[PDB]
Amino acid sequence: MSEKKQPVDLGLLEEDDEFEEFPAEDWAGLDEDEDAHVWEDNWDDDNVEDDFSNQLRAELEKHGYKMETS
């Protein structure tokens, strides 16, 4: 029918009216480092990145101290 897309696009207009260019620029702070990069790899790199964002982000500098303790 293609006529039911209008209220959904109105909902998208409401989502765009919540924040005016705030997620485009704030998320563009990372998109400028993500632009032109394959987004298939960004799912794994973002998976482990967000997974390690809480704690043990790098952890490679700590292994030198974990060798003698473990």
Binding site: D44, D45, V48, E49, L60, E61, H63, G64, M67
Partner: peptide, 27 residues
Amino acid sequence: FFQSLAVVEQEMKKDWLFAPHYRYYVR
């Protein structure tokens, strides 16, 4: 390689074009 890998970790970051990809090279 793990004892000397810390130099690759620290040298991997703090670069103009090579820093934002430091997570992919490690894993």
